[PDB]
Amino acid sequence: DKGRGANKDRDGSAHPDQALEQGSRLPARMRNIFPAELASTPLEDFDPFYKNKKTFVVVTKAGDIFRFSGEKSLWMLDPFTPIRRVAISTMVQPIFSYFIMITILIHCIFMIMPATQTTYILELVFLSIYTIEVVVKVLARGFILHPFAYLRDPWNWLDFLVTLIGYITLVVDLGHLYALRAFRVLRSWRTVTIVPGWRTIVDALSLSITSLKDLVLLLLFSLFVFAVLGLQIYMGVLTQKCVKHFPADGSWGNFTDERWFNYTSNSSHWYIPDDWIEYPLCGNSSGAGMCPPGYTCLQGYGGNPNYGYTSFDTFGWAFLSVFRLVTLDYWEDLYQLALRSAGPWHILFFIIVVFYGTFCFLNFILAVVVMSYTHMVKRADEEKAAEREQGAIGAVVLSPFFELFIAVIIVLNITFMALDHHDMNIEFERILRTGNYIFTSIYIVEAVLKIIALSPKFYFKDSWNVFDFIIVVFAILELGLEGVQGLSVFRSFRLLRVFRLAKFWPTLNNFMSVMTKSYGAFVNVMYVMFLLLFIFAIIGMQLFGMNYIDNMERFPDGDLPRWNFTDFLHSFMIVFRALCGEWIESMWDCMLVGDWSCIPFFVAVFFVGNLVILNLLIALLLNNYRMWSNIRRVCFLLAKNKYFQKFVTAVLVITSVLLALEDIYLPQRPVLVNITLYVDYVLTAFFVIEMIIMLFAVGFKKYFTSKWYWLDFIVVVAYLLNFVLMCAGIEALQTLRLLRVFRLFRPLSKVNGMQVVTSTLVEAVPHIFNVILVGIFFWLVFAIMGVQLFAGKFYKCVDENSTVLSHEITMDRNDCLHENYTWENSPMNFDHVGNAYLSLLQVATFKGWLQIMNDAIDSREVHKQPIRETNIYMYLYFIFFIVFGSFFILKLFVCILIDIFRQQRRKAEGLSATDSRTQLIYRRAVMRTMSAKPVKRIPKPTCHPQSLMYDISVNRKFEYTMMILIILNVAVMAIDHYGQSMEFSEVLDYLNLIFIIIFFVECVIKVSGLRHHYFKDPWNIIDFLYVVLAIAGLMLSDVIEKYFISPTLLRILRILRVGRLLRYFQSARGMRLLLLALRKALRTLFNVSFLLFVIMFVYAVFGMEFFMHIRDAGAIDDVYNFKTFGQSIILLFQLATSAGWDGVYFAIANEEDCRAPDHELGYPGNCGSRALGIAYLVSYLIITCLVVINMYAAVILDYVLEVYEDSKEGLTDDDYDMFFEVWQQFDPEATQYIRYDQLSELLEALQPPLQVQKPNKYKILSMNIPICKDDHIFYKDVLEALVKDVFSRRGSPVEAGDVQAPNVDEA
Amino acid sequence: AKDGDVEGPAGCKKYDVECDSGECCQKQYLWYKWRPLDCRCLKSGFFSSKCVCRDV
């Protein structure tokens, strides 16, 4: 074999084995020089005394192949050396290996504690015990040989490099290179191999990194294009501030261009409110930020936002801003900063980077990680199969109508734990504590009556009865320690009764029957995740921990942030936050007190943490989870007529655009008020007429049973109800008018690709609904526990404006109200289970979680002033919820849409659900050869001047140097920076002119030669449109400059021509695999993105009617609000990825100090409606973010897995396109016939896997090709003869037999 | 007015004192105005509550 035969053929003459260990074994062999009775095939323990250990393991070392022992290469000093014989009998024995795993695990404890002088001398004894490991193991294996060296396995490289660093950091360099001292923690990666089952997850981790090489180069190319695109349209724009006018009547002189600049550069003359560390941005566009009326909105004054780290002023900062946007990390702050200064039409830049960045390329990262883990599981499951190859109590207690009684008591008891809250009555508190004594007395009597009818030989076997017996013994110790004011945490084990119900409703029991089955897979991934988080938390604490203390003055107020690197627990939490997807806020504070080396740290903890480890958790969830009869003829013909249905669709679309135009400022448009009024009368007659036409066509029983017609019937009733109100008195309800938007989901379901997108949503809703119910259950356990920890503890004494007092001034609520301050509660507060649910939603979506977790770790006791970080171990509550509620329940929605979309695409393509995967690879290869046509060549002309021009046009050396000059034209754009000198820009505009004249030459060669066929290639249009506008921008001396040609529009066409390089990436294999999956999925990815816009239209119009008049709180202000349609689409697109929904919630639920709507004065009221705001955002976040954004990951997983499967077994569409690029040069006129003599030259000119090697004529006659008249053969007969050749040699000639039956049944 | 005005019968319970709804004053002069009292049960641990005269 490759490894199983080469390692044995090298044992023949080169170097043999030395020893083996399979269940306490240690042999003594040699390299066929002087071996003394080790083993030939004796399987016995007669000769030696030490070979008896390696004698009974003859049936254990041959388990799978050789996966039981390891073999040294005895080739340097093995025999006649008594020292090296001890070294084999030291390395092999397991007590030497379990001694190091204790030594590493003790050494990791001394890292999480702050060091001292006794830590140093204890550090020195670990450094001399790891030298003993190296000096023994090098002595038994040799330093570097070709067989089996010490520096050959990459677990000894980490053993050796970390030991050599512990010499350098302990004899010299005590001030310089502090950084290398922190990489002695990488030795703790070796303790992965102590948790059983690790080789499945580590080998999937290694395979994921090496299979992302083709995608990291494609992602770095796409970040390059988006950063140059962001550089050319956004440099200088984040420095736009409202600046005060130069004072006309007064000081600062009269006027001078030096005194104007002196006045304007002053920071005191720039507009800030009496808050807001950063300054607000303005713009001169029609929907940008507006200045107060003494200001003028200038560009170029005083620093970029976020300490200067958020800009497009240079290529490197544009590269960080674009990477922040694809990675989706606080992007709504970059999004709102960009549209406030450039205007709202720049939402188009953000749509393009989100669509191709996070909805495509971060979903190719998930697909590679899923394929890597699935391939490692099928390797392990295949190998595991090779391992395989008292009398009356019984009528009462065992009654099925008695088990129903306990199921009532449990649901009653779960309700009484959720009804417990802060500041209740006495009589309400008396019911809950009396219900405790009843429910425990029921549970005791049940456990006695089930051990008298099921005597305790049998009771303790059921494994629910022994769980229930633990509940009863906790209830009596709670009852005995009831009056005691001692420990009293036994009363916290009342939460464990909630899992006793799982016994009854089965989809909770079937949910937990998976976790108790595949628990070893979850343990290996959780331990590897927490081991990575440990390694990063010690490195960053020693790299960056001292900068926070030494440079504390650079932070605002001169105080440490909540998130820092000063000790281990802060360092673990700031690294855990980056795995949840938030890293740039912790990296701004790191670069402020530190150097540049915070940027490689926070990308690597994001790349390993979020993109690889959490995607491995999703991969592990997939694998485990007579006039009456003539009228019904006319109405039936109208209902089926095609021109009638286009009219009905057109009315519904035109009328819904009218519904987006009614907003604020509508009573100032009095003509538009009358337009929308008469439309409501035409529609309330249109809906009635179209209902009675469909009621005579379809009938009664087929009308009122359809789901689209019940939706249709409600809109008819809603416009008859609004009709009879306006005919008698009452003005029409505006909510019932908006029900006509639902009429346009049925024309949306017929747009040529929405059959797969809507069927994977209708079929997913009973699966989504059971995951909601299991989600509501597990969050209920954490919601009760958060009430029992934090109810009443989020109060604090506050100043007159917003400031929390110190605890030295105000100690309690007595001190706060004696000094006339305000004792105030937090808006997210854990005061009852309903508030806890809304709090646990913000910690699971990671939007708002930072303020909830500040209040939890500052909490002391009821009526005490909170002190910062006074119980910092309350972080353990939030880690345990994020792992089991966010990382496990919310990613289970992605698993649902992946499985259903595999089914609904197999249904739509006509395929069967009874053919295996190997039978469908064979069918796809037959469907493609029958839909294949030869490509006709572009004709060569005859006049001498224009024929040469054709010959140099089609040349590949011309097409290569045409691509180099496009890459050179755009790399010059990447060195534009903000503030460049005028002599720098004159160099780059003379170099730009010599590129326009070259691109004008190669455009006219490709039109003189290679005629009107030129305009069929989609990239020759953009190559033509740029060169025309570039000559027009330089010619015409009288450049108008009044809106003539945008310099932005000219610079987008330069960058858009780089997409020709996606055609030249079709030479690299892994890139060609990955662009093909994007090309085949691009129709159904657009259909998801067009369903998404129709859902956004529904929430825009309803949100414009609920939240048009609310006052500016939270994240809602004079730019971002629900006042118009265009401004609603700005918010709901941000809200579609859940980014910043906590501050939108704070304004659309704000009902504290709000004016009431007065109908007589004509005042709308600015108030919030908390109840309607919860049902707006939570309904939006679960529809648009959990099931429709996760639809992008369902589609890309199904097309990437299809294309990679054709690379391994099938034929991959580009290899059909490969066939007709070489059929073309032997059949140029599309005759679709070549002669018999040419096919020996054609079969060699092919590419793998479709090429036939020379000598061809030995292999040509082996296959039968039906030759037509005059030695002419057909392309279909050649191609079908080659597909049979490909499927003959891959697996077996038996699997060549399964492809004729598609070739016969279809032809 | 003075901090500690009972405003009720004798044997009544003041602010922040345990009670059983039979011993609770009608009002109380605490923090610069007259505030009523009602015996409410506040959160004081896991499924534990201490019932105390609290202002409403």
Ligand SMILES: *[C@@H]1O[C@H](CO)[C@@H](O[C@@H]2O[C@H](CO)[C@@H](O)[C@H](O)[C@H]2NC(C)=O)[C@H](O)[C@H]1NC(C)=O
């Ligand atoms: C916004 O428009 C104003 C004009 O209303 C521009 O202000 C001019 O800026 C230049 C320097 O950039 C001054 O010398 C002029 O005196 C300003 N004009 C007026 C009328 O004040 C301003 O540049 C624009 N801001 C942008 C494009 O960011």
Ligand SMILES: *[C@@H]1O[C@H](CO)[C@@H](O[C@@H]2O[C@H](CO)[C@@H](O)[C@H](O)[C@H]2NC(C)=O)[C@H](O)[C@H]1NC(C)=O
């Ligand atoms: C709190 O506000 C009250 C509201 O009037 C202020 O009232 C004073 O109360 C003190 C002590 O009870 C009296 O001696 C004064 O006559 C009150 N008036 C003024 C103007 O002082 C009180 O000032 C505020 N608290 C403090 C500590 O000043």
Ligand SMILES: NC1=N[C@H](O)[C@H]2[C@H]3O[C@]4(O)O[C@@H]([C@@H](O)[C@@]2(N1)[C@@H]4O)[C@]3(O)CO
């Ligand atoms: N990457 C982030 N996404 C959230 O949308 C943001 C909001 O929530 C949060 O807690 O604090 C603020 C910001 O730091 C956040 N960071 C934090 O998570 C926030 O703007 C306040 O609402």
Ligand SMILES: *[C@@H]1O[C@H](CO)[C@@H](O)[C@H](O)[C@H]1NC(C)=O
């Ligand atoms: C800013 O303005 C103030 C008064 O307008 C002036 O005294 C001061 O010197 C100016 N410059 C700086 C750098 O503060």
Ligand SMILES: *[C@@H]1O[C@H](CO)[C@@H](O)[C@H](O)[C@H]1NC(C)=O
């Ligand atoms: C010009 O303004 C800057 C601050 O804006 C100030 O430091 C400088 O002194 C000013 N020039 C004069 C002549 O005052």
Ligand SMILES: *[C@@H]1O[C@H](CO)[C@@H](O)[C@H](O)[C@H]1NC(C)=O
């Ligand atoms: C706001 O804070 C400042 C600074 O602590 C304080 O002096 C002021 O009283 C506060 N309240 C206001 C301005 O209403």
Ligand code: NA
């Ligand atoms: Na962040």
